[PDB]
Amino acid sequence: SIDPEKLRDQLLDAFENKQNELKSSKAYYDAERRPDAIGLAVPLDMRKYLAHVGYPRTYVDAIAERQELEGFRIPSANGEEPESGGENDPASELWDWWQANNLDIEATLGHTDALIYGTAYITISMPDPEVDFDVDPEVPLIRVEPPTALYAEVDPRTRKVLYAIRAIYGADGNEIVSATLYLPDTTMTWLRAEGEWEAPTSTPHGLEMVPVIPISNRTRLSDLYGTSEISPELRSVTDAAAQILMNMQGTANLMAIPQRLIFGAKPEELGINAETGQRMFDAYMARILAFEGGEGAHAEQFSAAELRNFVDALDALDRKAASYSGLPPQYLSSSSDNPASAEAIKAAESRLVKKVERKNKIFGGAWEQAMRLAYKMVKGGDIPTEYYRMETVWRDPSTPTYAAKADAAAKLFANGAGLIPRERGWVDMGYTIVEREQMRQWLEQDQKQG
Amino acid sequence: SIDPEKLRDQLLDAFENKQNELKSSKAYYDAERRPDAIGLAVPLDMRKYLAHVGYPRTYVDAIAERQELEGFRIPSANGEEPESGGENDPASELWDWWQANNLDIEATLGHTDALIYGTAYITISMPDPEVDFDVDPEVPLIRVEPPTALYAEVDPRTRKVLYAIRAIYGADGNEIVSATLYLPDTTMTWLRAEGEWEAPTSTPHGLEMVPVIPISNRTRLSDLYGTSEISPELRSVTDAAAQILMNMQGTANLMAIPQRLIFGAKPEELGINAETGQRMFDAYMARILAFEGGEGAHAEQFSAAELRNFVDALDALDRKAASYSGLPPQYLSSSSDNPASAEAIKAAESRLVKKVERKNKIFGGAWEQAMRLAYKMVKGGDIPTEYYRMETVWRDPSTPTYAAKADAAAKLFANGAGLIPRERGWVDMGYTIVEREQMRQWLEQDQKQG
Amino acid sequence: SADHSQIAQTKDTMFTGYLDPVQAKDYFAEAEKTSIVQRVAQKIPMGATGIVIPHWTGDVSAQWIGEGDMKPITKGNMTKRDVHPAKIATIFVASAETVRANPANYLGTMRTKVATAIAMAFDNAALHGTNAPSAFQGYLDQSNKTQSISPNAYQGLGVSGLTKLVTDGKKWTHTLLDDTVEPVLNGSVDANGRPLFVESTYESLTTPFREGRILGRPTILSDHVAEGDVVGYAGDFSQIIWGQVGGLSFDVTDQATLNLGSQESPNFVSLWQHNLVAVRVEAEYGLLINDVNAFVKLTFDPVLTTYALDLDGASAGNFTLSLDGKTSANIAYNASTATVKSAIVAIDDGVSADDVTVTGSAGDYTITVPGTLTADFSGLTDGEGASISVVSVG
Amino acid sequence: ATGIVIPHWTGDVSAQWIGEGDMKPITKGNMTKRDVHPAKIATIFVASAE
Amino acid sequence: GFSADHSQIAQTKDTMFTGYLDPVQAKDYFAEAEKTSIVQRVAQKIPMG
Amino acid sequence: GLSFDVTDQATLNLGSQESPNFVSLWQHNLVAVRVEAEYGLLINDVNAF
């Protein structure tokens, strides 16, 4: 057995312990001050003028900004046809809870934390009308929680969650205003948690499993707890580039102007006053300085530093930021000349597109799981066997080109005499799993006219 | 219970304190003076010649110009009645209030402030009959209020407002002229100025919750409160470029011209006036100057400073400004490229379009919440549960390729024999809800005529 | 800026630089302290003006009478006392770069530490009276009664202590103990050497330390109620009322000017000139104890009590002194100092010249005795301000 | 293998009661840090190939 | 601090504001109950004329 | 127009230039209101009255 007060202690230690592992990866995405970014040539008084670099934000956004769930594809036990039953079909039951929880907004935020911190947690519950849950009360209340507010213990034998704590800091002091413990058997919440002098509220649940699921950015099969998408190579080039910018920023102040010198001067004859150390020249353009000179007196310059020397080194790091991230090179401006054609679009987008299709497969594995728990909770009983085989379905990550696909799909369908049936032509043009239902109604209405 | 006079005296201190966050962001979008923007190399007497940089205003406007709402979609209880698009339907019932408040004007402003400061507040009431107005007295009077005039305390446990204050300064920012406190079950306003408050006007409103909804700009679930788009990389490149511009400018006043010296000439032989330290002479073309060569005297000169040694560093920071903001490079670096083709536009615009399309989700999640609350206020009673599935519908952020779209949509429809019903043909051409409702009547007149 | 200046926070010896090996917890952080008084006294709604508590004081009365024997007249009478708030406040100051970096969350850490320091100041100002403001009326340690508990807590609290509390017409409602009391509740055995307060196999925690009851009264536990010889209290905690006019304000500036010196030797620093940032913190509290003799102070065994006697300069007649309700003769307002010691040991009780002590002169005596001491001014012609009080630790 | 460092709080942060319009006091926090390094335990055993 | 009627700074303690800022009346939080008879409880109540 | 600044940030003297007795508004709890206006006047011919 186990002690719930002792878990309330033990989990808050593990949750606090975790925060410094996240803290570094946050600093790259926020572009906060980091010691390694500082340009070593810059004088200590100028070293205040930092030079932040945007590659990590650019890379993580250019993935998370390009995935959206369309829906789910639970197969029927007999006579399989997702076009047939509409609001009666189980694929629509799942989609209603996706709309009603606003998951089409909160998932596109949670996926960003799952990439930055390597994991984020889906949480399942039933709403309580003694609390201000302004939602449909017959819908399971599904939330996503960032790892800056939740920790879950994972069994390394099975990848099952053993137990988890969600913790809420107040406005201030990192005071833990509230903590919630999820167990295989029950959920518990302590309502003023800064030393937990409140008594536990509690709620049992029917599930044999903890009602929390980790989304996690797996890079490898060995990668069992997930990892930050901001890879060591992308960090290394981000910090390396920051030093070049900061050294150039000093150079543009200290060295870009050639320093002028005169040797063999007698300061008394130049009229350089001793107590101020300065003679007041006039800088108007046409004038000639006549110097009394003699005794080998002559004038000479230190050169400027040539800023080209730094700029031609930044351009190599603009290229390696592309190489290590797989972005289209024009997203980093590593070259400016556009891809001119619907084909050259696909060539440039190729690496990014296959990287997003890869994330969609893995993040699909979290929602394909969590919807089983949501169903098994709200409908009770046991999972209908087909649900174990459901696919998530995601929008095509490719940049949408319409006029190229239009002439393709038209020539395929050939006014109904063609190679594919109508509903496939609608998938290939890219209309969504719900929009194809809006059309399948309008099509029947147009067929009453001609 | 809790005292409202305590709360307005407390929440005014929180609202006034908060301004010390916002003043830092305002300084970038307004292009006001920063110390970090000052180029060090210009002499102290020249430091008055500031030179500001437009990147923050250009990035924020390039998003805020493109966000436009077409309308709302609500599922009609379509498991019994899909028929929709006409009089008395809920999508029109909400779109009526949207136009009657001119939120199609003020939301563009509200979205701008949500990007500049990181948050803005939608505020809801019935109109006062006591005050003469330009308003329809049956419509819920919905307004957007900026974070320089409203502050709302949010529960980090539930993401929900506890209470809020809307407080207005005089023509001088030096005193408050009125403040309104919103509580979950009532509203009150102290109408006279801060030095002379009188007894408040007040009303209940029957709602469960405070009639203030925060629009907030977010990148993560870990952003428990919204954050500016003028991110510290874009601040750094803005301030870095300001120094390069200012050092270039000072160089063009002092160093862009050669400096001319003569060594060894005796001032009394040159005829220098001892009272004034100089001799003037007629400087016209080809007049050969001649000197007696005492001390072996001769000329020499300091070179100019080459201004290109700064300009080919400004042409690096323009590429960083493009790269970190995700604008088309053509908005920054003139003749870095110019697109010849429809797909070349879809390349260049890709990052900007996809970022706007994501902000449309996050702000849509405020407006769908505000309209549902305004319905509960004006209709009374309770929400018909389909309204929890309400979707905002937004314009496509792309520049309209109308010739390419028209040639494609025709090849799809094929004079009615083709792959799609007429109505999706109209949606693919991008006609708004109201403009499609016009066409649905004009189509009937044309079919009547034959 | 001067690095490691005593007022200003700035990047100095206090920070390691935030290298990966820095542990996410101080694994030996003790949990933060909290007010006791704010969880045992009545919280009363209160405003900046302060409040007035009214009270009844009439000898309303009626008399037996015969047939036709004409009836007597009587009176009600009424009185009031006012109560006022006092501010507690502080400022902390940091370099703008320190506010920017917020190293180790120092700014958040400070904002909790000041709130705790303020909560602890309110406890000690009410319990022990240490550095208490002028506006607070009474503090618990000012009580005229003490009981020692250390050989057997049951005989201590439930019997001996209760006797000296109920005899004044006061009553026992709660008891409040320091965590250092644990090893005198543990043990406290019966004659056969079994403990009281715990069950027959001694696995359970001790009943009062569960926040359980003693003879029907609840037990309140604290890690910080002890000071000097005192380890706890028992009494009528309904006799305490307290108020708070507003929560802890926090107010923040780079723009203001401070003084780093004292008032008469000032060193003005413009926060803007040095680019420092300052945070103001303040709260208003009020407190009243209806009378301080409603509580018996709890100690270990051999405790001895000091009292200060103050006739307010009165100039003819006599006072008299009492221990445990036994009463001495009249004593002259100017009696020579050894007379007071002689008049105390002349009580019909086991007090003697080796235990009892006195110091001072005419009308300013300090008295030390092994018990409850009280004074009567009824024999004094002009004793119109005459008084007695209990002396602190030092 | 680089070891760890553990911070600890040490500041005596405090506040004073004040009258109306009195000079507020000023106060500062304090901390310390401690370092920990690991060490190795080892042994060898040897056998004939048979 | 400052003098009670300081010439430069206005304060709540200043004579000028007397009769404003009057402390608010409150319930007697220390009121003890009206003590009821014990004799009328223990003794048997006969009818009497 | 007649201008009012409200502040508690500044320092004030509370005596003359040679005995200034400076006080912080912010470290004490003084709020100060500063009042300023600017006027100019010309009479073209003071003998015309």
TrEMBL record, chains A, B:
This is Portal protein. It comes from Mycobacterium phage Bxb1. InterPro entries: Portal_protein_SPP1_Gp6-like. The gene is 11. Pfam families: SPP1_portal.
Automatic annotation (TrEMBL), chain C:
The keyword Transferase does not apply. It is found in: Virion. One of its GO terms (cellular component) is virion component. Keywords: Virion. Its main location: virion. Residues 24-300 form the Phage capsid-like C-terminal domain. The keyword Iron-sulfur does not apply. This is Major capsid protein. It comes from Mycobacterium phage Bxb1. The gene is 14.
